[PDB]
Amino acid sequence: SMENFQKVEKIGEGTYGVVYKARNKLTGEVVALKKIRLDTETEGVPSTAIREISLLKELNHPNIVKLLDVIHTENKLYLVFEFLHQDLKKFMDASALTGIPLPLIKSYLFQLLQGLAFCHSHRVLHRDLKPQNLLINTEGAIKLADFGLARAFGVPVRTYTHEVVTLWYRAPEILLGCKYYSTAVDIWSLGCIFAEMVTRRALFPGDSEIDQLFRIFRTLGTPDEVVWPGVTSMPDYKPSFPKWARQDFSKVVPPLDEDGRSLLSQMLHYDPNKRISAKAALAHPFFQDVTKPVPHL
Amino acid sequence: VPDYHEDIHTYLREMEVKCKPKVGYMKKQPDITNSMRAILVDWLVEVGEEYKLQNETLHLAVNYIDRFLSSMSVLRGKLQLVGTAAMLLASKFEEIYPPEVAEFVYITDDTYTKKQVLRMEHLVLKVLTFDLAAPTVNQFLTQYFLHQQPANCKVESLAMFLGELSLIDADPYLKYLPSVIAGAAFHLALYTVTGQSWPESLIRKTGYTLESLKPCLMDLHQTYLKAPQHAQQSIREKYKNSKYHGVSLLNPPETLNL
Numbered sequence: 001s002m003e004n005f006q007k008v009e010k011i012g013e014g015t016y017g018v019v020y021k022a023r024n025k026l027t028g029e030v031v032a033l034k035k036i037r038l039d040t041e042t043e044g045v046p047s048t049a050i051r052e053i054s055l056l057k058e059l060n061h062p063n064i065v066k067l068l069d070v071i072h073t074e075n076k077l078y079l080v081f082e083f084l085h086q087d088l089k090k091f092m093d094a095s096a097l098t099g100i101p102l103p104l105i106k107s108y109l110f111q112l113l114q115g116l117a118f119c120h121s122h123r124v125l126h127r128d129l130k131p132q133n134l135l136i137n138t139e140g141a142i143k144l145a146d147f148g149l150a151r152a153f154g155v156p157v158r159t160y161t162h163e164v165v166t167l168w169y170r171a172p173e174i175l176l177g178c179k180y181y182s183t184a185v186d187i188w189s190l191g192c193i194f195a196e197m198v199t200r201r202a203l204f205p206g207d208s209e210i211d212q213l214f215r216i217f218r219t220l221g222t223p224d225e226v227v228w229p230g231v232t233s234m235p236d237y238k239p240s241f242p243k244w245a246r247q248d249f250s251k252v253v254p255p256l257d258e259d260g261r262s263l264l265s266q267m268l269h270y271d272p273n274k275r276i277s278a279k280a281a282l283a284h285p286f287f288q289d290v291t292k293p294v295p296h297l
Numbered sequence: 298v299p300d301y302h303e304d305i306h307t308y309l310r311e312m313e314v315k316c317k318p319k320v321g322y323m324k325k326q327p328d329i330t331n332s333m334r335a336i337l338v339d340w341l342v343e344v345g346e347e348y349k350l351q352n353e354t355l356h357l358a359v360n361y362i363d364r365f366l367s368s369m370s371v372l373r374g375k376l377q378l379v380g381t382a383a384m385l386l387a388s389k390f391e392e393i394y395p396p397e398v399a400e401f402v403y404i405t406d407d408t409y410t411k412k413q414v415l416r417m418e419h420l421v422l423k424v425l426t427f428d429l430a431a432p433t434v435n436q437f438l439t440q441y442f443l444h445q446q447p448a449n450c451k452v453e454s455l456a457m458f459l460g461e462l463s464l465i466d467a468d469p470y471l472k473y474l475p476s477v478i479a480g481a482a483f484h485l486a487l488y489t490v491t492g493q494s495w496p497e498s499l500i501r502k503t504g505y506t507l508e509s510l511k512p513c514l515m516d517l518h519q520t521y522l523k524a525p526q527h528a529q530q531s532i533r534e535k536y537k538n539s540k541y542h543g544v545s546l547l548n549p550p551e552t553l554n555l
């Protein structure tokens with residue numbers, strides 16, 4: 001019931017409403033309330049809300065934001081979530097001084113990969129992994145949030161919505177208009193986030209699809225049939241694309257050690273088939289000494 | 298893809314038990330029958346064809362209807378409203394481009410208002426507690442299709458055809474789980490087209506054998522043989538299309554030799 005909740009302040013906003021920090025007056029629990037405006041006419045419950053709720057109800061995991069309850073109070077939906085303190089983008093900004101301690105980057109990547117592997121094991125694609133949708137708390141946890149753009153996939157997948165994923169984090173196979181995309185798109189996004197946590201700036205900050213592709217090509221090389229069988233046959237591949245040489249990978253994220261570089265390169269592999277699964281990444285040598293320290297700020 | 302094949306199959310096998318409707322619900326519906334349900338599902342097939350919706354969307358909508366009707370007594374004049382809201386919910390969940398609500402209102406020939414449909418949408422979500430990611434016969438079929446050697450488009454289409462027919466008749470298909478119907482549909486399709494049988498590799502994957510599938514297979518084989526005579530025909534018509542390789546024109550086998 002809405003009665004048991006005391007609103008504190010606004011903490012974010014989406015397409016269909018703002019998000020409030022609130023507290024349960026009876027248990028003391030601090031929560032986030034995601035308001036979804038419904039309208040009696042028009043279209044009814046938005047599909048984004050239909051997907052976010054039904055998928056989140058299956059996804060109970062320490063690294064996925066927990067949906068606690070759904071309240072319908074006279075023509076709006078309130079999604080009651082566990083309260084998390086800030087998003088990863090804000091934390092990187094706050095760390096503009098010195099970087100993020102490597103133990104923390106490693107802890108965050110490992111936790112993100114755990115959450116993602118759980119999603120993928122439960123046939124869910126996230127499709128909008130960007131720092132703003134990754135929430136951190138004071139105990140060192142990081143969690144995937146905002147499942148409005150997610151979907152339950154089938155095996156094997158069929159064609160789903162095109163041009164998905166916030167552009168900077170969008171995978172080459174989406175950019176090149178492939179008929180099929182799968183779990184590997186979320187890994188590409190996490191690869192961009194890994195890079196971003198180290199440098200504190202976006203890896204591929206394009207402003208259009210072609211610009212995005214070209215920035216990727218200039219960093220990783222333009223892909224040919226050797227690196228990615230089928231590329232040249234993909235719907236939006238063009239033979240006029242400039243053919244950039246692949247960079248020394250140590251120059252993409254210069255602070256990265258051998259293991260980190262190895263892991264990043266497997267997350268940023270062109271061929272979706274060869275790109276590492278979240279499951280396989282959890283056992284990468286980069287994580288050999290992982291701990292879960294409290295955020296330094 | 299390959300890294301999660303087993304995890305996902307395991308997970309869907311767990312969820313299909315959780316999302317199962319009650320086998321006996323129709324006995325407990327005062328005003329509706331298996332035959333009225335048959336009519337509704339047949340119409341839903343047509344709606345799906347009219348709006349070129351995924352087969353998955355059809356399977357989900359039927360799952361939502363049977364679950365809703367497991368909890369909620371419904372009058373005959375309201376059955377189609379339940380059906381329409383379920384198909385709207387299925388479309389929003391499953392489709393890239395779901396039909397607008399006005400299009401769903403229209404297809405009911407103005408029996409109901411937009412407001413009714415929208416109110417029913419919300420009621421159905423409440424009754425289902427938003428649990429819409431239900432495993433379907435379809436979701437298991439596409440996994441089973443990966444165990445063909447080689448892949449055969451007629452086998453796939455025919456299996457989907459048969460799985461779709463099982464949606465029409467609560468008796469007896471309500472008592473079988475999606476993975477079991479998909480098993481029977483896939484063996485039957487394979488046998489009809491190529492003479493092959495439920496592959497060893499799928500025993501390893503599912504733990505189902507021809508023996509465990511027999512009862513469903515016995516039922517499906519009858520439904521197949523009697524399909525031209527069934528009062529509902531929208532699926533046969535749908536599966537004459539080349540999109541589905543005209544598999545409804547294939548002849549069923551007279552015996553399964555099991």
Ligand SMILES: Brc1c(Br)c(Br)c2[nH]nnc2c1Br
Nearest residue numbers: 011012019032081082083084
């Ligand atoms: Br904290 C928090 C939580 Br928890 C969720 Br869930 C959000 N969804 N959008 N913005 C959100 C913020 Br801020």
